[PDB]
Amino acid sequence: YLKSVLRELVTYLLFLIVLCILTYGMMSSNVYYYTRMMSQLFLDTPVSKTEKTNFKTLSSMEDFWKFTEGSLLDGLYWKMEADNRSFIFYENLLLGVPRIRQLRVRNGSSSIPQDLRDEIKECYDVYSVSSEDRAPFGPRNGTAWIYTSEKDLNGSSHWGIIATYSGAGYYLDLSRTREETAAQVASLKKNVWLDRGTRATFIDFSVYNANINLFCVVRLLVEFPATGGVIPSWQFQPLKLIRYVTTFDFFLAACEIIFCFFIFYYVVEEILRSFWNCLDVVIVVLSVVAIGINIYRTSNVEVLLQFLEDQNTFPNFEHLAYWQIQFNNIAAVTVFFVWIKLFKFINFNRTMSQLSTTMSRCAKDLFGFAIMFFIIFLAYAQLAYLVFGTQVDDFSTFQECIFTQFRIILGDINFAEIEEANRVLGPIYFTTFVFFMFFILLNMFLAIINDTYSEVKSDLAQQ
Amino acid sequence: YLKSVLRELVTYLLFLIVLCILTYGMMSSNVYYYTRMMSQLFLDTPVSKTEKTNFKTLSSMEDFWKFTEGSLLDGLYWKMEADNRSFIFYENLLLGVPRIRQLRVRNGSSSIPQDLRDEIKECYDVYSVSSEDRAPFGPRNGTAWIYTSEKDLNGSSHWGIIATYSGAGYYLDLSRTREETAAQVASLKKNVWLDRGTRATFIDFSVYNANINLFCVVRLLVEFPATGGVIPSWQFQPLKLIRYVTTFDFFLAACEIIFCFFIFYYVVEEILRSFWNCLDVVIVVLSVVAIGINIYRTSNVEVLLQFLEDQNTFPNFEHLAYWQIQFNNIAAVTVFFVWIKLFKFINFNRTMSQLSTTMSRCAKDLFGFAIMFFIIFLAYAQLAYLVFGTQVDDFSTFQECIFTQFRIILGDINFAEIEEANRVLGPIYFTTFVFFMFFILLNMFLAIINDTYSEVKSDLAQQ
Amino acid sequence: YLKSVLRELVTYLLFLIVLCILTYGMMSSNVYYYTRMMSQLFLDTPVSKTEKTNFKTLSSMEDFWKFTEGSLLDGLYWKMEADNRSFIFYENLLLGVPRIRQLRVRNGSSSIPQDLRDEIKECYDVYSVSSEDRAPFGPRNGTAWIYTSEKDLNGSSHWGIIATYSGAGYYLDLSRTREETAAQVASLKKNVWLDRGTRATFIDFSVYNANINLFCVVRLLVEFPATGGVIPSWQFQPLKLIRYVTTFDFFLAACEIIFCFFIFYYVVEEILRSFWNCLDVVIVVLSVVAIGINIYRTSNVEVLLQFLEDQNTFPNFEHLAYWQIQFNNIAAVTVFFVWIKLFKFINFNRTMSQLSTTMSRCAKDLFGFAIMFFIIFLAYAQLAYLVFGTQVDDFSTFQECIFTQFRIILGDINFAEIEEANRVLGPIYFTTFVFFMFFILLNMFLAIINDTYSEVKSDLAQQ
Amino acid sequence: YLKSVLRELVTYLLFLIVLCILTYGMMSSNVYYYTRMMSQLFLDTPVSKTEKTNFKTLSSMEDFWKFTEGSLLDGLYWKMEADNRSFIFYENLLLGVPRIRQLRVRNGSSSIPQDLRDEIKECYDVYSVSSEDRAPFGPRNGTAWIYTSEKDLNGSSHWGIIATYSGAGYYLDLSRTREETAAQVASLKKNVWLDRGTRATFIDFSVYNANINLFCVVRLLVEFPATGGVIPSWQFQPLKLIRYVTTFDFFLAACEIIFCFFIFYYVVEEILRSFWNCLDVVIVVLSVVAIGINIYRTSNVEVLLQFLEDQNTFPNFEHLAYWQIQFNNIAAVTVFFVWIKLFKFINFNRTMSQLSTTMSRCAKDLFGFAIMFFIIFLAYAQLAYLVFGTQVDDFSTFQECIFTQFRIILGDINFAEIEEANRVLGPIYFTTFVFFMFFILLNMFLAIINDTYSEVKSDLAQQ
Numbered sequence A, B, C, D: 001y002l003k004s005v006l007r008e009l010v011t012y013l014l015f016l017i018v019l020c021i022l023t024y025g026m027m028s029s030n031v032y033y034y035t036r037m038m039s040q041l042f043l044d045t046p047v048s049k050t051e052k053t054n055f056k057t058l059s060s061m062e063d064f065w066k067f068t069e070g071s072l073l074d075g076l077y078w079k080m081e082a083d084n085r086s087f088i089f090y091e092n093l094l095l096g097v098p099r100i101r102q103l104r105v106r107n108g109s110s111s112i113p114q115d116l117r118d119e120i121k122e123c124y125d126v127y128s129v130s131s132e133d134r135a136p137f138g139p140r141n142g143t144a145w146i147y148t149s150e151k152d153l154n155g156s157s158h159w160g161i162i163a164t165y166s167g168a169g170y171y172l173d174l175s176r177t178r179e180e181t182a183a184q185v186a187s188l189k190k191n192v193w194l195d196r197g198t199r200a201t202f203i204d205f206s207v208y209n210a211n212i213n214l215f216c217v218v219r220l221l222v223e224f225p226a227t228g229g230v231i232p233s234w235q236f237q238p239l240k241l242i243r244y245v246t247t248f249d250f251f252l253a254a255c256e257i258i259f260c261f262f263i264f265y266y267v268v269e270e271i272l273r274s275f276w277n278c279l280d281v282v283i284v285v286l287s288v289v290a291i292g293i294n295i296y297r298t299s300n301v302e303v304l305l306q307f308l309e310d311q312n313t314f315p316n317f318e319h320l321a322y323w324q325i326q327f328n329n330i331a332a333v334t335v336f337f338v339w340i341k342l343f344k345f346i347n348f349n350r351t352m353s354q355l356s357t358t359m360s361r362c363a364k365d366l367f368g369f370a371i372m373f374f375i376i377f378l379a380y381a382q383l384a385y386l387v388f389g390t391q392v393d394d395f396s397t398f399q400e401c402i403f404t405q406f407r408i409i410l411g412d413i414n415f416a417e418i419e420e421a422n423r424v425l426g427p428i429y430f431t432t433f434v435f436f437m438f439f440i441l442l443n444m445f446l447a448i449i450n451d452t453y454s455e456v457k458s459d460l461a462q463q
């Protein structure tokens, strides 16, 4: 039994390091700064030398147009060298051509107050697939003014902060030179290409670095609520598209196929309560999905080979970025559980074996009270979301209300804006919540543990 | 008994979802940004392009006048389209006409130092209803220089940060165009309309959005302590005045009448200790008040129909805003308690039934020590309020002293300004407080729980 | 026994409200903003319209001179009305005349490196009473260039942040008009009145408000370490000098004499372990000192009556401010203990009487471990002070090291600057400290309480 | 036995104060501000009057060159007096001559994407000793363009934030006057002395203060990742080079030799489990290393005596600074343990002796669970490092991930940037982590303590 379990033990250990390497391998070290530089270059720089706003700060269409004609252009272009080529920071190819796309809503004049009408007029509804405007507004002289379909226009539905956005819309592809684009942009600014009905706009472009070998994929997303104003958001995604350069890169490819063998091995072992069984299943599952994604999704690299042919087009990577995110998401979670599986082997010692059974007994009593806990915890949340959330950012959405309360329990708080929001309930909410939750209810957990812990020490001491 | 209780159970459940819908229904999603845009447009923008102060920052009359003639005007007006009409952000009707009002105090020269007199001269006392100045100061050519009464001038006493303010005062109604107002404002600036005796000023206007259907009601409040300086405060209230547009809006109206039936049902059941009884009463009570407000207060909508007739006047909404706040306040609290009522049904399981009786026994011992606790907790508060509170904002008022101490217990602290305030007691206060309260006294709670918890597990285990 | 104790009970209660009133009475409500306005007017305003530094920010002599000739002058003067008079904010008399004073150190060339000499030359030592320079440097045409004595120059030793400073030094009294002062200041700037040997400078002036009746006393303190640079500090003290205006003010005077009777009563009762006895002594003690200060110190008001005669001089209030601080310090502490004395009466109930004896038994075991605790707690402190404190502000002095660790236990942290200071020990210190202290050692307290609590519940339950 | 232990007790006490003095003695008080002034003078000042960036803010080569030609020069030079001499703040000799050095990497065109080539061209790899470029780029007219060796160029490998850097490289020595340097700098800017291949640059200079007797050694370090951009870092090290000036300084020298006797005494006593034995060893060890460093490393002072001869050269102190850091590091840690040794003497009292054996028994059960704890704690860390760390600064490196989680447990959090990084896992990570770790797992510690504490009180009470 011992050696039999010890047989599986090393199998697990061998399985550990293989994965630990792929993580270490598939992750370059300094990637962070590469993003950080890109981000600061775009997000953090003043729109114009005269203006103090950043892209993070954009409050208006006027703000936006400034940003376009402003730092963005300066951000994208450098001199240097072709001269049709520009290296960002001097280290980074601007890869192919940038693309701007927007979404427009059909005229919503249907909405009827009674009675106002000619004192309005019309309106435009909140973005929806139904409300999406396909009419060819404006001079109709190009893709900018002509609707295209998410099928015809290669692209995927993007999930924004207030809404999901289809790939379809009105778009334009920029130029290789800072000037030609400016001409294009100004033309789009001269003609009004951002109107009442423009809910959201996209700016997508990709960047390659040759020093380290990586691609940065950028989506600048700007939303226009029916309430007016601007909600900027951004995404910077590094990608390793060419997986084979260095011998180490090939060494990982071996390990990847090596790693593939292990899972297939565990697949068989999985075939016939228990917790570790329940655990083992998960790791196997995620592992598969991780691989499936890795193979017939990310390994495609078809867009690259296409773009490599014609480098004057827009290299749509939006999917490739999308998936490796999903990949890293899953890949990480696997590793997390993989470590947790190590506990199954720790019971060798008395103390551990003692502790092992304790937390097991801890579970049932906890799981009951946890229910009792969150019911209250959610009650405040739903309360706060009603009182606040038309005022305070932190409470804006019901999700972040829940989050906010955790930060409160930990002590991260903005109290002032709460008190500003409602001078009465704000204090009451904060006081009562901090009282019952943090003084009493939290302690009720720890109370349960002591009992179940001491009891297990008690009766096992009897043996 | 079981099915009998189960009969009431579903009644509660049905009552839950009805309410959950009205909450979800009566609350639109994205309202937050609508406020946030309005706020940033006014509060957050520089007074003048040359000046770095915001409305939040106003330190002086000069600051104030700048703000009026400054961003405020630019905030209110847009072009566009009548041209007598302006859309804020382009999405928002400026609704009717803005109104400025101030409060003035009778000359307080009565206050006598001995002896100074001609070296002063006179003075003006802190605002009070008694001290309120009704004299027609200045050129006396209009409402600006002529006192009106809160009865004659439709309006309610507003509760400010240093004082409550009657609706009465000296006011002026602005114009539809940015220019005419500027002429008015400048005239009020040319003539001195803000003098030594001006304690507080109001700026009230309303804004409609047609994309979503909502009204934003704005009160810009500026106080002038007898100590000089400025204390700005602001309120942005969304309102749904027209409740009937979409079928969904009508569907809620049905549910509202449907929901009315349930309470009337519970009214009868309430008619004949116990805790749940004590609870059930509360929910019934609040529910009624919520409805009464909803009907003969908020449902009035008389001002709208009046304003709809004449759109060149000032649409006084101050009350309508006031009540829906009270409404949302009560409405929220109800929901909170409604969820809590769900516990009454959770005792089905042993574990829950176990936990249920535990916290019940927890109560008496806690309630005793809680008294013992706050006596100390308040002692520090009253101490801090004496030591600090002439220095530190956080301690300014005795209320916020209490609040501040909670943030300390949680770890939210500004220590520096404490140490700056008093280099001796500041540390001592902070150290001792953090010591006895957080190390010892908090733990004394949790100590009590363990005993009462383990004891209940102990003796019930005997059964 | 019961009624006998009940006799003392009401005596205490009557004693409570009397004190509660004097606190409420002797403290006006809105004083905070009065300070806050003054502070922001001076501390918070840019030195010059072109410059972004505040008084809080001063880094250099050049910074300082700018501030003097800069915002300070603008801060002090207003127009308006005599015109020799100016109202700050328009609400505040500039009271009398401002005064600037500095401290200078004898030339410290004695300090000998071996060997440098003519490559230096000389030096100036850190401020001390010994090192204080009495030589009449400069043109010697006035008090600015002539040393005076703290006896001759009415004044008290002030306690600064890096050093205590005698009242003596080189000073100048300003003028009633913004211009004349500027001439004076410029002359002091033309001639070099701030030299290598100038360790610290003072700016003292007082301000009266007639709306509410109060005096604000201001000390602007600027230190010049031997290391160069500037360390600004400031003090704003409100004073109520004329205690008799309103009938309420006279009503307090009655209560004050009334309150005097109570203490004299308790004096006798104090005359013959125990804790409450030990407590009762303290309250009596502090009460006396509070009164003694109140009478033959603060009630003097001699400087006022002198200044009232000649309003063109400098009204030295530095002492009067100094004492009422001491007064408020003591006065507050008394109130704090007074509330605590209320516990002596709470044992009526079983639960309280139960809890009462528990914490009493809690004491001995705690007091032992507390020693064990701080020994470690101080160890880290002394460690951090050695590692940090040449780098991080928070650790600058050993005192604030102790303070800083409390904020860490609570979660208030600046970690970045720690890691920046020492990339190795910084993490180790922070990690280990947070580990042993917060995980283990804190819990060791709470462990003790449970035992001593449950035991007391246990054995008393046996009865 | 008692007096025998009491014999060692005073030996320890005498050993305490000797060390406490050396700490107090070898540490001057106000050194902090001396650094703080230097830091703010360089780090905190705008690059140019027109520019808002600080040295901390440098984002680009252009930023850097500005800083050089900018505030740095102004920071170093002052007038005053030779005039070839300049006093920083007027209090500080610029000591000798500043020196700039950079590191360059061989052209990395070897890196092959397939296929791009002439669309790149070339590249430059991440810094390494191998990749280090020794070629004499540029006009080759001086040390700036000529490679030197860390042997030939006196210097030590420096440990930067992304990499360790050899002392070797391309350097230049500046001039005594602000102008001549500017000519040099401009020449280095005219010619391109910062190219694609420049990974990191150094700016080293030293400063003496004669008021207090100290040296400040400065290393300004600027890194250029292969990703472009700039990563500034800085070091300010005070040094006491001349240990003999004041009699007090000589008094310490006596104590130092006195202190040397004690350790040699303990050396013998150390010669023959136990914990205190294990402890005593450590203190002895560190003490030795501290002394050895103090003698044949720091006491060398050879560079000074050399520099004192020729004051126009670069006074390389980099080592001297390096070691006294190591010295202070060790010196501090010793003191820390020295205090801890005091516990060995505290068992005189019952309570202490009681507590002593408790925590001893606490150990074994804790040490087991601590393992169980960190396994999970690290799991999240490794998870967060995969999910985040390409986005969030706080998670950038695996080390700081661990650190970040502690700050979370304490409540120091930036949640926003987490949610921005990954809108899905970010919340999940934060929520689950805060849940299991802070609610459950932490309490599991405290659970263990209660058992082991109460049990020890229980059975010892039986005696």
Ligand SMILES: *[C@@H]1O[C@H](CO)[C@@H](O)[C@H](O)[C@H]1NC(C)=O
Pocket: A106, A107, A108, A109, A110, A122
């Ligand atoms: C606005 O709506 C009206 C009626 O639905 C329509 O005639 C008009 O074309 C719409 N405006 C635009 C720009 O589509």
Ligand SMILES: *[C@@H]1O[C@H](CO)[C@@H](O)[C@H](O)[C@H]1NC(C)=O
Pocket: A139, A140, A141, A142
């Ligand atoms: C569309 O028409 C406008 C107006 O004449 C013109 O400026 C623009 O260049 C046209 N677009 C194209 C693609 O020809």
Ligand SMILES: *[C@@H]1O[C@H](CO)[C@@H](O)[C@H](O)[C@H]1NC(C)=O
Pocket: A152, A153, A154, A306, A316
């Ligand atoms: C989609 O990809 C195909 C692949 O060749 C290309 O021909 C087409 O132009 C693309 N459509 C877009 C980018 O809208």
Ligand SMILES: *[C@@H]1O[C@H](CO)[C@@H](O)[C@H](O)[C@H]1NC(C)=O
Pocket: B106, B107, B108, B109, B110, B122
């Ligand atoms: C100030 O008070 C005096 C006396 O009470 C009065 O004559 C004068 O009118 C007052 N000033 C104003 C502006 O009312």
Ligand SMILES: *[C@@H]1O[C@H](CO)[C@@H](O)[C@H](O)[C@H]1NC(C)=O
Pocket: B139, B140, B141, B142
């Ligand atoms: C009141 O008198 C002033 C001064 O003549 C004048 O400017 C103002 O227009 C008058 N107001 C009205 C409403 O006539």
Ligand SMILES: *[C@@H]1O[C@H](CO)[C@@H](O)[C@H](O)[C@H]1NC(C)=O
Pocket: B152, B153, B154, B306, B316
């Ligand atoms: C109050 O409302 C009535 C309603 O018609 C209106 O006539 C009157 O002018 C209002 N008074 C004000 C706004 O002061």
Ligand SMILES: *[C@@H]1O[C@H](CO)[C@@H](O)[C@H](O)[C@H]1NC(C)=O
Pocket: C106, C107, C108, C109, C110, C122
């Ligand atoms: C500096 O010291 C020297 C010698 O102690 C002395 O002659 C000289 O007067 C001092 N300087 C000043 C300004 O006092």
Ligand SMILES: *[C@@H]1O[C@H](CO)[C@@H](O)[C@H](O)[C@H]1NC(C)=O
Pocket: C139, C140, C141, C142
């Ligand atoms: C002292 O002498 C200087 C230089 O002549 C002169 O400017 C200044 O006014 C004199 N001071 C007095 C008080 O006369």
Ligand SMILES: *[C@@H]1O[C@H](CO)[C@@H](O)[C@H](O)[C@H]1NC(C)=O
Pocket: C152, C153, C154, C306, C316
């Ligand atoms: C101190 O006070 C006395 C009181 O009359 C005064 O004469 C003297 O000038 C004062 N000394 C100062 C302010 O230096």
Ligand SMILES: *[C@@H]1O[C@H](CO)[C@@H](O)[C@H](O)[C@H]1NC(C)=O
Pocket: D106, D107, D108, D109, D110, D122
């Ligand atoms: C770049 O690399 C090529 C080939 O390795 C080489 O010929 C060239 O000299 C390199 N550039 C520099 C500046 O060294």
Ligand SMILES: *[C@@H]1O[C@H](CO)[C@@H](O)[C@H](O)[C@H]1NC(C)=O
Pocket: D139, D140, D141, D142
């Ligand atoms: C190296 O050559 C350049 C170009 O002629 C010249 O400017 C520079 O002064 C030279 N350097 C030296 C040290 O002569």
Ligand SMILES: *[C@@H]1O[C@H](CO)[C@@H](O)[C@H](O)[C@H]1NC(C)=O
Pocket: D152, D153, D154, D306, D316
């Ligand atoms: C290293 O130090 C020696 C000591 O004299 C000196 O001669 C030599 O120039 C130095 N080398 C440097 C600073 O590169």
